């Protein structure tokens, strides 16, 4: 079961623990950990006894895709509390970054926009090179404007998309050069 | 300025009650103390956790009694340790203590010593703890053939059996002769294996006993009279024996026996007694060495065969291990401390024995150069020699000789020992000496413990009390304080000796102060005191009837058994013919106390090279908050 | 010596406390408070601290915060870690020094540091498993194009913790060991150990 640490409050929100699961806890003001600061569930019970020595509310915020909150998650949030989100690198956040707890429910969370591939097989099948010198890299964040040109001997076709294209959530319009 | 100190036995045993004494010297008010014992090094479980308070009414001295369960957590294999953590207020004092796997003691008693193929072996296993008190545990028993292969295992319980476990094992008709063994061990301690042997052989009772008894317990190599031996033959019911005896002698060298055919004699056994002399000439002619000095160190054995005139019974008996010596005695310093206090009286426990190892009674002993210091051995062959040491750092070398009058100087026994100066803290020359009159001490008396102090007078008034501890059977029996007034050099402690001191106890006392360069100093001293080996209670079996009434085959008899109230007594009646054939592995009281003393954690007669050596050598671990502590002990066995 | 372990513990506590002074507000780590946070150094602090939770009191917010940092910042969409502020001591990284297959090696290192702190930082960081999976995807795809024994070794252990080291990948892990007992490559011997 979830141990009742004296002069302290748990960090993890889980109540039932299987074997070898760790139980994180922190000590209250004026106290600190004694030896081990966590507890492990073994057959005879918790091996490290959680001890501390002398020196309408909402639930957890909803998880998003390719992102996470900036603070540390809590089991219960007091009313009028607010957390913020942030996407991974080269991802673009779309929507309200901050959500607020009101009357046991959160506000609408944002999403994360997917960047694009600059595929090497597509570049060779369309006969285009980056034209800003590079080995690779410089990859299309959602909203970034890439550019290419044709190879030496090809030209843009009649209805080929512009050489300067912008990626939008995992979709990229590659130019094409024929003849 | 305040110093917190803990003392715990050198080695901690499982399922045994262990005491811990807590002191807060130079402190005021109440000191909350919480003692926790954890495993080493992981601290997965809290093996014990007790609390106490050190109040000024108790002179800031308390104890914590705890029993460590034999948890399934401990793993031949590596040695196991525990962390002892004492918390006084803010301060915490920890010590890493060695753990012994011995759970307690197991004693095996077989009804007989030798058995015929087909018979049943009846044996009882007594299951006690380190206090010899009956306990209820699970015991593993292994029956082992002379070859060594275990042939029958079992796992039984001692619960509701009052510490006595009655078992039996049937011997097959077709069986291998020789020395069989029973091997038992507690379930919790598979490393502590107790054993007893019993011979299996085809035999018949001899109906009488033959006794080969030499005049002396040895043979002086320059005695022209030779070894005179008296043969005493008597029936198992008392009456003497008339017959004829064939006696023959031999020389034993280690394990090589050389019979002397020329020494063979046929003598009449008249009135149950006969005499036969091995002449010195035959002895020298028998061995192929003219130099008699080479026979010294070897032994003689005598074999006698007595045949009744009726020719219906014959008994062969032997008496071996008769050392050929040049001195009737042998001096040992195995009971005398090997550390002295310069300037204070140094006590020596001389141990004079006969060539066969038995104690020697009334033997004059003295120190070379000090004819005044001449003492007499007691009934246990232990004499006390007190000398006066000069204040010095020179190794005190003692040579003790026997001064038995009427014995020439060439035959007097001699032995040489050496003692080292008790090194003090910062060469402060602060010494403590505990002395006790060496004499057979018995339960129910009182021993005066003399605390004698020697130190400079500049800090003698600060010493207001001594801390004394008693070690018995490998556990702390009693701890207390001894009030000492400024100016008094010697104070007397009336120590009441009860049955809890059997067979022996160590008294280690120490005092602490702040001296010299404002350094915290501890000075200690210990002494070993022997007690008259006996039972804790009593058990006597005597005749419960009139001694005009003679025992007759089949006749009812009354047996008077007088012992402790509520005790469960187990009995056995054995024919003395059995003991005429084999008298080994017999359960006595002396053997029980022998086993107990061999599982002792002390390794010295007394004292040590420093204040930590006194505690370590007396089986104790001292650890103060200021940092003064004893070195670690990682050896279950004492140092050689 | 049983008594020495206490002082040995004191040093670890001391070191941990001393390392807290360089924890940037982003729950990252760098040689100096003003210096830009290093990817490899933050991952290495996770490593040591994850193996030390059984010895002294390690705060979960510190360890788990560093993990959440590496995932949201130093993680590319393909899934591979990039060190944006190289450590000043290039001799404390071992085999990643001057390594050409830096992407594969650095990915394996940071990933292993994540999987060692999984059981500890699974409640607070909710994005941990997906990132472990993302790192694992890149290592699996370009594992066979390895050449350096070191990279094959470190990526093999990074994949064995997931059970994703089978087939031709497992074959390459076993055949790169010369004499069937060592993963050796021309250069410093410390890299081969
Ligand atoms: C650890 O520390 C404890 C502290 O209590 C020590 O226990 C002392 O041990 C004494 C052994 O010598 C015991 O004294 C005995 O007490 C008998 C009374 O029995 C008590 O019954 C109560 C039940 O209410 C129990 O709780 C107690 O534990 C006792 O069993 C007395 O008949 C008898 O004598 C007394 O002490 C002196 C002796 O000179 C008399 O002057 C006094 O008037 C009184 O009659 C007997 O000696 C007792 O358990 C206890 N005594 C005291 C004073 O605390 C442990 O011995 C310590 N253990 C170690 C290893 O150091
Ligand atoms: Ca004795």
JSON list of C-alpha atoms in Angstrom, two decimals, chain A residues 11-14 17 22 24 26 33 35-38 63 66-73 86-91 115, chain C residues 23 27 53-62 64-65 68 71-73 75-77 119-120 123-127 134:
[
{"chain": "A", "resi": 11, "resn": "UNK", "atom": "CA", "xyz": [5.50, 12.66, -4.22]},
{"chain": "A", "resi": 12, "resn": "UNK", "atom": "CA", "xyz": [4.02, 9.81, -6.27]},
{"chain": "A", "resi": 13, "resn": "UNK", "atom": "CA", "xyz": [0.24, 9.61, -6.61]},
{"chain": "A", "resi": 14, "resn": "UNK", "atom": "CA", "xyz": [-0.11, 5.82, -6.91]},
{"chain": "A", "resi": 17, "resn": "UNK", "atom": "CA", "xyz": [2.29, -0.82, -5.78]},
{"chain": "A", "resi": 22, "resn": "UNK", "atom": "CA", "xyz": [9.57, 2.78, -6.21]},
{"chain": "A", "resi": 24, "resn": "UNK", "atom": "CA", "xyz": [8.88, 8.81, -4.20]},
{"chain": "A", "resi": 26, "resn": "UNK", "atom": "CA", "xyz": [9.50, 14.41, 0.16]},
{"chain": "A", "resi": 33, "resn": "UNK", "atom": "CA", "xyz": [15.52, 12.45, 4.33]},
{"chain": "A", "resi": 35, "resn": "UNK", "atom": "CA", "xyz": [19.57, 7.64, 4.37]},
{"chain": "A", "resi": 36, "resn": "UNK", "atom": "CA", "xyz": [17.35, 6.41, 1.54]},
{"chain": "A", "resi": 37, "resn": "UNK", "atom": "CA", "xyz": [14.87, 8.95, 0.21]},
{"chain": "A", "resi": 38, "resn": "UNK", "atom": "CA", "xyz": [12.55, 6.50, -1.55]},
{"chain": "A", "resi": 63, "resn": "UNK", "atom": "CA", "xyz": [-0.87, 14.69, -21.68]},
{"chain": "A", "resi": 66, "resn": "UNK", "atom": "CA", "xyz": [5.39, 15.24, -28.59]},
{"chain": "A", "resi": 67, "resn": "UNK", "atom": "CA", "xyz": [5.20, 17.66, -25.67]},
{"chain": "A", "resi": 68, "resn": "UNK", "atom": "CA", "xyz": [5.00, 17.99, -21.90]},
{"chain": "A", "resi": 69, "resn": "UNK", "atom": "CA", "xyz": [4.35, 20.51, -19.14]},
{"chain": "A", "resi": 70, "resn": "UNK", "atom": "CA", "xyz": [7.09, 22.72, -17.68]},
{"chain": "A", "resi": 71, "resn": "UNK", "atom": "CA", "xyz": [6.37, 22.22, -13.97]},
{"chain": "A", "resi": 72, "resn": "UNK", "atom": "CA", "xyz": [6.09, 18.92, -12.13]},
{"chain": "A", "resi": 73, "resn": "UNK", "atom": "CA", "xyz": [2.71, 17.16, -12.19]},
{"chain": "A", "resi": 86, "resn": "UNK", "atom": "CA", "xyz": [6.01, 23.04, -24.58]},
{"chain": "A", "resi": 87, "resn": "UNK", "atom": "CA", "xyz": [6.70, 20.90, -27.65]},
{"chain": "A", "resi": 88, "resn": "UNK", "atom": "CA", "xyz": [9.88, 19.07, -28.60]},
{"chain": "A", "resi": 89, "resn": "UNK", "atom": "CA", "xyz": [12.69, 20.60, -30.63]},
{"chain": "A", "resi": 90, "resn": "UNK", "atom": "CA", "xyz": [11.84, 21.58, -34.23]},
{"chain": "A", "resi": 91, "resn": "UNK", "atom": "CA", "xyz": [8.15, 21.18, -33.29]},
{"chain": "A", "resi": 115, "resn": "UNK", "atom": "CA", "xyz": [8.21, 19.09, -38.90]},
{"chain": "C", "resi": 23, "resn": "UNK", "atom": "CA", "xyz": [21.84, 22.86, -11.83]},
{"chain": "C", "resi": 27, "resn": "UNK", "atom": "CA", "xyz": [17.03, 21.43, -14.62]},
{"chain": "C", "resi": 53, "resn": "UNK", "atom": "CA", "xyz": [19.63, 6.25, -5.65]},
{"chain": "C", "resi": 54, "resn": "UNK", "atom": "CA", "xyz": [20.34, 3.08, -3.64]},
{"chain": "C", "resi": 55, "resn": "UNK", "atom": "CA", "xyz": [23.12, 4.76, -1.61]},
{"chain": "C", "resi": 56, "resn": "UNK", "atom": "CA", "xyz": [22.06, 8.29, -0.60]},
{"chain": "C", "resi": 57, "resn": "UNK", "atom": "CA", "xyz": [19.00, 10.56, -0.73]},
{"chain": "C", "resi": 58, "resn": "UNK", "atom": "CA", "xyz": [18.55, 11.66, -4.36]},
{"chain": "C", "resi": 59, "resn": "UNK", "atom": "CA", "xyz": [15.77, 14.16, -5.09]},
{"chain": "C", "resi": 60, "resn": "UNK", "atom": "CA", "xyz": [13.31, 13.01, -7.76]},
{"chain": "C", "resi": 61, "resn": "UNK", "atom": "CA", "xyz": [12.61, 16.50, -9.14]},
{"chain": "C", "resi": 62, "resn": "UNK", "atom": "CA", "xyz": [16.30, 16.96, -9.98]},
{"chain": "C", "resi": 64, "resn": "UNK", "atom": "CA", "xyz": [13.33, 13.61, -13.51]},
{"chain": "C", "resi": 65, "resn": "UNK", "atom": "CA", "xyz": [13.63, 17.28, -14.45]},
{"chain": "C", "resi": 68, "resn": "UNK", "atom": "CA", "xyz": [12.29, 15.93, -19.22]},
{"chain": "C", "resi": 71, "resn": "UNK", "atom": "CA", "xyz": [13.55, 15.05, -24.28]},
{"chain": "C", "resi": 72, "resn": "UNK", "atom": "CA", "xyz": [11.95, 18.43, -25.00]},
{"chain": "C", "resi": 73, "resn": "UNK", "atom": "CA", "xyz": [15.10, 20.30, -26.04]},
{"chain": "C", "resi": 75, "resn": "UNK", "atom": "CA", "xyz": [15.94, 15.63, -28.98]},
{"chain": "C", "resi": 76, "resn": "UNK", "atom": "CA", "xyz": [15.50, 15.90, -32.75]},
{"chain": "C", "resi": 77, "resn": "UNK", "atom": "CA", "xyz": [12.26, 14.72, -34.46]},
{"chain": "C", "resi": 119, "resn": "UNK", "atom": "CA", "xyz": [11.46, 3.24, -13.04]},
{"chain": "C", "resi": 120, "resn": "UNK", "atom": "CA", "xyz": [12.19, 6.41, -11.01]},
{"chain": "C", "resi": 123, "resn": "UNK", "atom": "CA", "xyz": [5.21, 9.02, -12.86]},
{"chain": "C", "resi": 124, "resn": "UNK", "atom": "CA", "xyz": [6.32, 12.63, -13.32]},
{"chain": "C", "resi": 125, "resn": "UNK", "atom": "CA", "xyz": [7.64, 12.52, -16.89]},
{"chain": "C", "resi": 126, "resn": "UNK", "atom": "CA", "xyz": [4.81, 11.19, -19.06]},
{"chain": "C", "resi": 127, "resn": "UNK", "atom": "CA", "xyz": [6.72, 11.60, -22.35]},
{"chain": "C", "resi": 134, "resn": "UNK", "atom": "CA", "xyz": [11.94, 7.29, -30.67]}
]
